[PDB]
Amino acid sequence: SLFSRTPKVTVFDNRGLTARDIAYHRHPDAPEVTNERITPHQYDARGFLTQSADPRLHDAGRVNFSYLTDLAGGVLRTQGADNGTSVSLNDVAGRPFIVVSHISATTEDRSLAVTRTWQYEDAALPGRPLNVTEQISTEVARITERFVYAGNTGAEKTLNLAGLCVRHYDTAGLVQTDSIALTGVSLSVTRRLLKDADNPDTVADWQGEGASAWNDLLSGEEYVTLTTADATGTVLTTTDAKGNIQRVRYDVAGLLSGSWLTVRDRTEQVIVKSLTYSAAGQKQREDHGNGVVITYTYEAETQRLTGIRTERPAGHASGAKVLQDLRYEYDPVGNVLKITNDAEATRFWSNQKVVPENTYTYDSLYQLVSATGREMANVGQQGSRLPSATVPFPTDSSAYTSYTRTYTYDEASNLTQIRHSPATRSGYTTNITVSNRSNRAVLSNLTENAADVDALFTAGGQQTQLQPGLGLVWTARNELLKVTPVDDSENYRYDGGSQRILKVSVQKTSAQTQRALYLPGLELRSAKNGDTETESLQVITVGEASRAQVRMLHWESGRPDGITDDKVRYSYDNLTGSSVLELDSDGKLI
Amino acid sequence: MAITTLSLPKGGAINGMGESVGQAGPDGMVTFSIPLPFSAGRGVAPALSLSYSSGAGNGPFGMGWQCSAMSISRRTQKGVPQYNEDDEFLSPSGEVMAIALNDSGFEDVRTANRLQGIPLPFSYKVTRYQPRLIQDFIKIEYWQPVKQTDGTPFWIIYSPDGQTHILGKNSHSRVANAENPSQIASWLLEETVTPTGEHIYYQYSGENQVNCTDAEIALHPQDSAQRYLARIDYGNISPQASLFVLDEELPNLTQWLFHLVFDYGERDISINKIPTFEGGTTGWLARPDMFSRYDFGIEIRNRRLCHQVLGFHRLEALNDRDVTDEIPVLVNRLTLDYDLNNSVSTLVAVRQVAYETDGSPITQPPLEFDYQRFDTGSIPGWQEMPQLEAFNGYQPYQMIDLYGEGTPGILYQETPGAWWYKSPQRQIGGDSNAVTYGAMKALPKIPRLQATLMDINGDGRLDWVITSAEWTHFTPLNTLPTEYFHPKAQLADLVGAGLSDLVLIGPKSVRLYANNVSLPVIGIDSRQLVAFADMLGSGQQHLVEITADSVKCWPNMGHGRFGQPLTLEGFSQPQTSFNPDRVFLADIDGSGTNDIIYAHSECLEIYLNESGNRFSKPISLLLPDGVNFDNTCQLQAADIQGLGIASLVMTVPHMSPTHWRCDLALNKPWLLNVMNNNRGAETCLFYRSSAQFWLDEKQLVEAAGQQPECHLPFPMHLHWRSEIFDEITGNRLTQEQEYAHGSWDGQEREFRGFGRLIQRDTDGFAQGTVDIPTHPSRTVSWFATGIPEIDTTLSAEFWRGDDQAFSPFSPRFTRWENDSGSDVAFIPSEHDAFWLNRAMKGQLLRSELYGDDGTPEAEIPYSVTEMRHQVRALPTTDATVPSAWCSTIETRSYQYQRVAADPQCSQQVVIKADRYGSPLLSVAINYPRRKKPEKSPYPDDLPETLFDSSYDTQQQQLHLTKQQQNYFHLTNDDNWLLGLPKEQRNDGYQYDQERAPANGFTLETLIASNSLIGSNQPFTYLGQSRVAYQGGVDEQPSLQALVAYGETAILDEKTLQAFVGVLDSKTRDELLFSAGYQLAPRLFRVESEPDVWVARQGYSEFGDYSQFWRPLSQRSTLLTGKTTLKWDKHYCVVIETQDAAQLVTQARYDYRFLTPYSLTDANDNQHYVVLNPFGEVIASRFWGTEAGKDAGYSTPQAKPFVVPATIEAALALSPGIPVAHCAIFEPESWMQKLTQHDVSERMADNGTLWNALLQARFVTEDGYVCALGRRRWMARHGLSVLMLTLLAEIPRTPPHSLTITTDRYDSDDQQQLRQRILFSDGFGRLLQSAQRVEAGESWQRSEDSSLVVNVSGTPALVVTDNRWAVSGRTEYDGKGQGIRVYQPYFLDDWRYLSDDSARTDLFADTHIYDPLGREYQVITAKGYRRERQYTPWFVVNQDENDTAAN
């Protein structure tokens, strides 16, 4: 009824190119009404795409993207409503040569434009990249990246280094590759940071006649990550920069069967004792170092994840308990209709039979239009801050009250309203104001007028205000550089691939400071109470960033009383990988 | 351009030879091709195919098959050649040639004494010939010595790829008169040479007397003519541009790196005896079915069958080692098995064998064939013939094909002077091949008296011969020799004054009367019979004389000549009782040879003619119950079924009923009807006569009130049905062909093809719990016969259901006319029409695709494609007969999707073509969508809005995309290279819908002065492409066509608009220069068109001729550095690459396959594979240095690894193996294993049966039971129930492989053996994949390969040590699409779970495909549906939520 006669439709021109994508919108609130949504696309004589537009902007006679192409189809220019205008040209060898971006259309505001260029080896060499350059507006060009390659001396061959980049100087400093396997896996890499890397004023500019000069712009400290690998080129062990060793083992099918951690100057301890799999190779049963067992359950037909069951089993020193028993109910295409948890200790949902347990409803476009859940009665209205931690664990259904969220979406799939309706309290509404000519959008408190929305964004689609009186600065590469209030700041640094290597937070009244350095399987966290160290912390992280991770906290200095050193924190996730429970090395809830 | 990178062959899936059945054509024949599996060497190689045709006759590879290179032969189809200036020659394509014209319009002759720059001993007259239809524009020369005594003539064919071929230079490559070498029937390919200086040489063996009986030698002294292909040499060591046959002496055998050796029975056939390079000393074997052919006016005798083809490589030479006393080593071996038979020998198996270094054989499963056969045992008995019940049993009738319909009707005289004919017809509601006879038609009145000619059947030609006994006999002219009425030589001697009477005694055999060789005397009323009949199976009316104890046959050699008498033993009757009247001559077994049927009072005795050599022991056939044959009775042999084989029709007055028939066979024997690859795939083929098809067609034409006109007067055996069985899934595909508008041409005595083919494809599935609705597809296709009275009736039959579709295309005829040249249309004369229409024979006119699914839209096609043809007439020395080049100039495709009113439509037109057939100007047109109708033509279940919303203005824009191009050629001097890439440009034209011509575009409307692609009209420049060459004049090609670079346009003035707000002219341009782009002239320029920015790609430096012009360096652009290439000794393969950073890769080669086995990378680490005798990777490892020290696996020198012999052994290996991977291949597992010990023990006979079954190829020497060898044995000798029991308990399983992968180096004691098993089917498709996993819960496989299941119905679970995860399990339909794809599952065994258990118990998504092979529906394992609907202008997708609401 809701989904009846709502197909996806592809409309061709007379050359078999897609002129229109048609969709059919229907809200369960109003099942009588069906809104047809047409996304037009234009092509030129050659058959290359020139224009696209969403239904909302087509309705208003405007366009989302315009494309200008060379005669082979290569896109030399994109004018986007959301991300501005940019010009691109590859050389005849197919390599990046120039990109000019941060340009706005009205002809073309070129004044804040970033020009990125590449320099390769000369024609008598293979043509590997030598440096990347970035020139912003009227400022002098800065050399943001450099590459140095190995020759093929016997020593280099012995390290499987021949012709590969051994020194990559990037936006954060240097990455040095000192050893490679027969299988091609990096066995020893070494990172050094820029001098004065905590200051967001310091940008990489690798000026100088050779490596002797470039190295003089780097800090002294070396963060060495070492790796061990099997005959298939698959990682077995990782030694982090503070000497902590992570180890894994593979079963006869090549799947992870166990893992261990050896903290520096300690003995090896079990992080994953065992791990079995279904026929499809998806986790079935997982046994942790803390004796906690995870049992995963799958629909036999669709292989969809039906159950996540976490428990301390029979004969466990801390006493048997089911900590989580998640169950999922899908609609036919695999949207989540219902989530139940019978292990929930408070027994909250069988007490409150007015609103149902995590029920979700969707429109014909599979957008979430309604949801129900529980919140803690004390949370109050959602903003940017995290609620206050309730300590200790609440012990009764009074602690949590139910809620029902309702979501509203425009013709271009912008989320314009989150409406919150609790059981027995005053509800609130968060309104998001969409631009009249783009999908740029901000909360109502920033503006309630569509025509002023794009002025809160840079040309490239980067938001300049986070909240009222909190300002945002972005790098030349559109990464978040700095959050500043208009007196607590935060700022960031990234490597060559835009992956955050550094975060520094500062509060000045005396200036209190915290720093996070992100390395392989390791976060070095520190703090100073005005150039005097209050805290020094290794967060050892075991696993992969898209799966239920295990953290170990080791304090070099400044451990607070009430935390035993080298305490492991096991994390336990839901369907979407959100961290829901933490347990300790006894399996007890943290 | 492809930059050469060295790498080892990757692992792996089981697949065969590349054997393939042909698409069903308008000739109606079954075809089959096997590529000969042998090395390509350097690249220049023989590349031959062993191919079958149902139309083809006997030869060195058995009935139907051949494997030979190009030849030129004297024409034999239009009279026998006499070796004078009046003879004609045939091109390799079989097409008649004439002497060509030159620039000045004369006979293109010249004298020469230099050929390819090489002085010839004397002068030659060199005549260019041109074939009537031009395929490739090959140049063909006849080389004739000026003084005829100086030598023999030869032919040269210059292929337009730049290669040069010479035929019959030396006498071994000539089929010539045994009596007189001057008289040359055929010149066979002897040597090829390419522009790189690479050669292939073809060596033939002449026929001879070795291993023949003295009986044979006596009967056939003229036996030296025939040639057999014997050795092919390639990979010449010395690079030479000129042909080797032009040097003083030919190269030594040792100057060729590769050989291909055709064995004719001399070597031991056994897979255990390794064939050697030299032949041994027992000589080639004599086939039993020896046969002669007389086409060329000379006997050509045939005694040899090819039993093996062998690939030999010179391993020492290739490895730059000492060549002294090198024997070439065998690489691959192809065995050929025949069913040897005295009448007809047939090819029943080909198999690949190779050898391990310990000498022991390794084998692929044999590819088997079998044929329709005549069974001596089950001859159908008599049966009453109610079709003749209107006659009383005394009344004389002839069963004869009076009108030329390929089936005989009834000719009879009612009262004297009054002759009627009852024409054959389909009996309604009988068997589907049942023949009845229609209404009487009076013949014309016949003259007072005379033997004389007459046009009895009303076809215009005097082709019936009337005589009188006073009775009257009708005899077709084709049953007598060709110049019967103006005889010469022996024919004159025999008839003298002229014969008194001619009497048919069979379908094409005729008895005679009257009142250098020793010919017979035609006595008045003797105890002897004389006749014309084909007693030899060569296809001529020979002279035969039969007495009571002798059969003598004199071969017709043409022009009235008759050669020495041949005897045929095995026929006799007592000298008192022998009566000539009781003798009949007819091909009973369809072997080609007329057999003897002799009639006694109570039986018939049939003497089968054995390939014209002798007669068999006679088959005795009893007459019906209580019949006594005598003078009152009537008996004749006549092909009443229309099968090309005689049945017998008998009238007996003293009997009830009076009329009987005996059909001796219901199939035409010796036609291929079964292939089986022994891997799970069998194809069964079914034939049906064109004659039988004609009676179906005639009934339809009569039911519709029209007058039928047959144009095909004899029965051809057409490919009617194919059934392709998947023996593993139990699924199949049926392909049925139907034929109409058959055309044979009297004037040229040539078959033209069928005017209409209807093809029906139907999937058949085994039963499942989620059933797939099978919906057959129908393709209806029309082809030109080139006879206009047929071709003009075809468009009438096209689908008329779209009143707005454009009108049918019409053939254009052109003449080439020069100017600063071009095609110009003309209307030819009725004389030239015949030849120019003939040039379109077999060309596709129109094709329509349907799905016969019983829906309302079923009568409406998915798509319709139609073609227009242009024949360009070309002059020759013959004024009466022009040459012709047919091409396809327009192609129009309509996409309807079974909705008639709203199709999409596109059209591609070749406007101009150069003199060599290459396209110069062409255009691709996309028509606008039709004006929107008032109501929606699409079904009412879609959204109401969609029909209106389906419309877009982009659908209404007419697009024409114009493409120009030109080419390099090298025709100067005596070289010939055509169509080399040069320049191309593309231009876009776009108009509104009003400007589309109302009746569509034609070529004419596009070349007209007011054209929408005229140079007046505005356009959008789309780009251009140029190839530049090196090593010749400027950037023009030499004969070696060495590319300098490729150049394509990247920016024009329009595309530079990109930079307008960001860069300025000066900065923009100097960036483009530094980016490696450059300005070049815009091609096919118009007035004021600026230069364009171009990118250049693909630079190579090549070697000189001594290095076979091989590439020595490569780079993609001038911005990056070059990579060096170093070759091995003989420039076969590259052994080292070195890049611009000095980084070095090296490779050593396994020279039996010319693939690397070892590889040193840039860091000097080593990679290694062991290849098996078929070139597959059975083991691999690597080692080198890592982190300062030696690393990886132990070396093959340190720790050699033996690959286990079986999967069982391999699954039982202990950790510590020094290989990354190893692989066991089981390609023959679908064949049951049967050992001598199995057999000998189960009988207690000491191998008496085993050695009988091995001989009969029921089982292979290595113990595999052959599918068709079994069936053949079971049909002839049966099989005891003791053997059947044994065989029923021996299982089988789909082709499979096991790959073991180690996860650690062998130094590490943690090493595990990962185990992966793949299953393939008989079509080479991946069936399932099994990965060994840790012990745990799995489902259960029984010994019978089924799933164990609980009483509750769900699979029974157990914990097991032997657990496997099965993934990607797929059930395929006929077209190879995944019809069911199963979820992964655990199983306590690597073995195959039956498709039977899978369908019942395992979860699977079902995918349903439409007649275009597009997925339109999916039924998910849970029960839901995804559906998809295809229309010309939109596609509609519905997911599981959408469809669930229905």
Ligand SMILES: [Ca+2]
């Ligand atoms: Ca829908």
Ligand SMILES: [Ca+2]
């Ligand atoms: Ca015969």
Ligand SMILES: [Cl-]
């Ligand atoms: Cl707890």
Ligand SMILES: [Cl-]
């Ligand atoms: Cl117009």
Ligand SMILES: [Cl-]
């Ligand atoms: Cl070798």
Ligand code: NA
């Ligand atoms: Na006639």
Ligand code: NA
């Ligand atoms: Na190395």
